[PDB]
Design a protein around this ligand. Structure first.
Ligand code: ZN
Length: 554
């Protein structure tokens, strides 16, 4: 057949018998499409997506499939908070046969007896097939396309058996993640993280009934470093320190995530009846693909991604307001690790919740009652300690601050000190091959502000709890409208100054909070084109389908 995509930007590989023993892909041409390039590759996390089982005439489907899956992944926190700090490239790897036809494919993917997708070295006797990403595709991409333009060092068809891993370690520092999308409807998924031996890729299907959730799940194993919360077993020591989101420590005073206990749906429990593997929440995507990321996974994932960029200095989880009753306020309240205790906890939280979609639960019977504003804040600086001010007040329906019988406003303020992240260098820094141990509480502070509503509070129907989390300059980092905020879709398009579209680009779509002013320094180049101007930055995004246009010369 013929390519149904532009060939103007491409890379060429040389695959000898170790990577293509049958010769079917000895000298393949791989067209390169830019799904998103908001900044220089040196400042963003670079994601490279290749297609398995797409013929030359199916590359239009492959690009659209990558855009769909990537956009749906960017709707999950913590990815969403970094959506504009990814650069995404689609590499149109052509297979002779479609996957469903079962002939020759670019990556020799088979589905084993465990429904796992695996690059099969022994399918055609290509003994280094599953090293293709870090030894062939990666170095060619980093030399020709990546703004760093690192010249290839070692010949991938010549390197002798012995120290064949170290010369390719740099690949996974310039390319944050390799993703392989299989043109199929079968439901499978698998991540392969073993950087000491060069593996950092995952495989997911394009059209399964849960393709988008599977993509976000395997991306969390690969990029975020999260473990499966469905796994059995028993984390002994060393394994306890290694795991970001799993634990086997049963004393709530010693659990790594003690500071998060009682915050939203964080209640330690076993991942199954009679299991010694504990999770911080029974509703997380890393256990069941129908859920969102739990608070620990969001914290850990956010921290991991902060290592790969240089301009993120603080994590502020979405605060919550609850009636303070003393329930679930001390570590002893969390000693029961059964799933019954978790769901009883979530029911207690819902009964006391006064924020988000439960902001309406506030009523005039709240007089003389205590309310608690709570969130979790992670400092990203290993250098600068932070001080954040929490303000909370009772607000009437019309926006006025409620008062007591003396006319004193029902408001309270408390400043919290966020310590530095001293242990930062131990938490998947750029260049690490693995994670061994980290201090979960380094740079971490649970902040709780308890306010006693006076008994003489002049409450009216429709009153609500308002709050603000402010930084040292007074910027609002989160408020009582954050949880239910509307998000608007924004697209980045790439055009020449005359107005035509730049070939081999296909701008994707991500969401930002309504009213967001995008503040990004565009990359100086796009392929060999030089950046001129951008239309759409530094203005409030107030409509779905807003287009920001990057303009390039020639
Ligand atoms: Zn989780």
């Amino acid at each position: 057949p013929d390519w149904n995509v532009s060939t103007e930007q491409s890379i060429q590989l040389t695959l000898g018998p170790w990577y293509s023993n049958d010769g079917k892909y000895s000298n393949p041409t791989i067209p390169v499409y830019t799904i998103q390039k908001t900044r220089s590759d040196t400042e963003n996390m670079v994601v490279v997506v290749c297609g398995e089982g797409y013929t030359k005439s199916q590359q239009g489907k492959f690009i659209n499939d990558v855009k769909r899956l990537w956009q749906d992944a960017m709707k999950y926190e913590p990815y969403r908070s970094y959506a504009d700090r990814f650069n995404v490239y689609a590499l149109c790897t052509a297979s002779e046969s479609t996957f469903d036809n079962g002939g020759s494919t670019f990556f020799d993917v088979i589905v084993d007896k465990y429904n796992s997708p695996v690059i099969s070295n022994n399918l055609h006797g290509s003994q280094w097939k599953n090293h293709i990403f870090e030894r062939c595709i990666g170095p060619e991409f980093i030399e020709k396309i990546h703004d760093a333009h690192i010249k290839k060092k070692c010949d991938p068809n010549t390197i002798p058996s012995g120290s064949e891993y170290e010369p390719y370690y740099y690949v996974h520092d310039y390319i944050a993640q390799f993703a392989m999308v299989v043109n199929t409807k079968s439901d499978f998924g698998g991540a392969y993280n073993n950087r000491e031996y060069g593996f950092h890729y995952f495989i997911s299907p394009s059209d399964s009934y849960r393709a988008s959730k599977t993509f976000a799940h395997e991306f969390g194993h690969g990029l975020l470093g999260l473990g499966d919360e469905y796994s059995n077993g028993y984390l002994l020591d060393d394994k306890e320190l290694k795991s970001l989101n799993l634990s086997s420590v049963e004393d709530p005073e010693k659990i790594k995530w003690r500071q998060l206990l009682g915050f939203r749906n964080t209640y330690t429990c076993r991942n199954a009846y009679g299991s010694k593997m504990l999770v911080s929440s029974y509703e997380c995507i890393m256990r069941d693909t129908n859920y969102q990321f739990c608070e620990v996974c969001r914290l850990q994932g956010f921290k991991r991604m902060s290592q790969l960029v240089k301009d993120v200095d603080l994590y502020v989880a979405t605060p919550e307001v609850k009636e303070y009753t003393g329930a679930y306020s001390k570590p002893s309240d969390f000693t029961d690790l059964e799933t019954s205790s978790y769901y009883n906890y979530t029911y207690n939280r819902n009964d006391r919740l006064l924020s988000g979609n439960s902001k309406s639960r506030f009523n005039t019977n709240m007089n003389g009652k205590k309310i608690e504003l709570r969130t979790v804040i992670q400092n990203i600086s290993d250098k600068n300690a932070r001080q954040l001010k929490f303000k909370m007040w009772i607000k009437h329906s019309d926006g006025s601050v409620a008062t007591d019988s003396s006319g004193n406003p029902l408001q309270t303020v408390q400043t919290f000190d966020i310590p530095v992240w001293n242990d930062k260098a131990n938490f998947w820094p750029l260049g690490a091959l693995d994670h061994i141990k980290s201090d979960f509480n380094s740079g971490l502070k649970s902040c709780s502000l308890i306010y006693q509503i006076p008994s003489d509070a002049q409450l009216k129907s429709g009153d609500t709890v308002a709050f603000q989390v402010l930084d040292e300059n007074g910027n609002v980092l989160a408020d009582d409208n954050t949880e239910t905020q509307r998000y608007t879709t924004v697209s980045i398009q790439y055009k020449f100054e005359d107005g035509s579209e730049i070939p081999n680009t296909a701008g994707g779509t991500f969401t930002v909070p309504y009213g967001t002013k995008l503040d990004l320094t565009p990359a100086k180049t796009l392929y060999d084109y030089e950046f001129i101007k951008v239309d759409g930055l530094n203005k409030p995004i107030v409509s779905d389908g807003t287009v920001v246009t990057y303009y390039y010369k020639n």
